[PDB]
């Protein structure tokens, strides 16, 4: 049996891992594919818990299509968007 | 006798301390006065070593007068500007 809080904690951690790996360089890899997918699917960019990556996140164009640098700098936190998914709010 | 590298290391650390204290809240205090002075005097904002503060730095309007959010997000790193002062480059 999978608990709401434990599953939400892991998706956030899985995300943090992906984002940490994605900002390392400009190399096309799965982490970028995964980060670009989470961002598009949830309409978010980066996390509050990983603020040290925001500039790097922008530098690698990892935020969704359509929105500018200011919109992406102030985009919705992915950890919150993950919480809303597992709690059914959106 | 004061060594170039040790003095440059301390000004940067003194700065880091000030910036850490300045972003804590919106309270007018010396740390903000000190951070606003360093930023204006050296024409810089935040540090590369303290990227986790950039958004907070913007949130508190701690970057110099005249420049927008994009200019301030991509403003010159204060640790580098401190290095240029102690080495006589500018």
């Amino acid at each position: 049996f999978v608990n709401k809080d434990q599953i939400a904690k892991d998706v956030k951690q899985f995300y943090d891992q992906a984002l940490q790996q994605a900002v390392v360089d400009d190399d096309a890899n799965n982490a970028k594919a995964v980060v670009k997918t989470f961002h598009e699917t949830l309409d978010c960019c980066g996390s509050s818990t990983l603020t040290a990556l925001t500039t790097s996140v922008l530098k690698n164009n990892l935020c969704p299509s359509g929105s500018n640098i200011i919109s992406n700098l102030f985009k919705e936190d992915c950890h919150q968007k993950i919480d809303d998914l597992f709690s059914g709010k959106h | 006798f004061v060594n170039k590298d040790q003095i440059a290391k301390d000004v940067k650390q003194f700065y880091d301390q000030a910036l850490q204290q300045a972003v804590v809240d919106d309270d007018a205090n010396n740390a903000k006065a000190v951070v606003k002075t360093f930023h204006e005097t050296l024409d810089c904002c935040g540090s590369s070593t303290l990227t986790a503060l950039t958004t907070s730095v913007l949130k508190n309007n701690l970057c110099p007068s005249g420049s927008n959010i994009i200019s301030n997000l991509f403003k010159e790193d204060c640790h580098q500007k401190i290095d240029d002062l102690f080495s006589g480059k500018h």
Partner: single-chain antibody
Amino acid sequence: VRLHQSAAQLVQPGASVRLSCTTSGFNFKDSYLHWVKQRPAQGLEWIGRIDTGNGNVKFDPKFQDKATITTDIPSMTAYLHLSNLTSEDTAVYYCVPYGYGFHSWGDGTTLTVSSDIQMTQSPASLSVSVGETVTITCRASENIYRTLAWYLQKQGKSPQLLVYGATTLADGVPSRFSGSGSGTQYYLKINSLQSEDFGTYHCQHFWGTPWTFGGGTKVEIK
């Protein structure tokens, strides 16, 4: 008021040169500066790139030992050092900043020496009349995650950025231009084609390294 590029250089085989690129208005300090080679009467070729963040440099295997990239951060300048020069180095060298969005290229530096994701652009040639609606297509060998750009190149001039991302119109570009597409297939539609938009259309992906270009689409009046 972005990229500033260094002047022309005429040289003989065996020489060594330095082409330069100065930014202004960009976070040069923690960015990616790429160099793109354009051989006369031939396509766009990616040379290499510097990450000014860590100082890492990457090159297309062919330019591995000859080419070199260095930076001058306070002056916000990028240098491409080329050694053992030959006739196949006679080309235009464009400087391309990348990272906090998508940018227009430098005007280019002409060097004259005299003595992996595959892109599929379609059609190759297009014979149309003013007011007609045209649809150019670009297909990637893999999902490029909408990190594509459409450019318009007019004879002897630097490629003009039309659409970045898949759908975003670059500032100052007329509304009549429309980018669309996803995953592996992308399109550029030109609504009510005009005289000032004739030439070669290029697509490009920015999903990792090396950067690759479409064959080109030549639009002309009959």
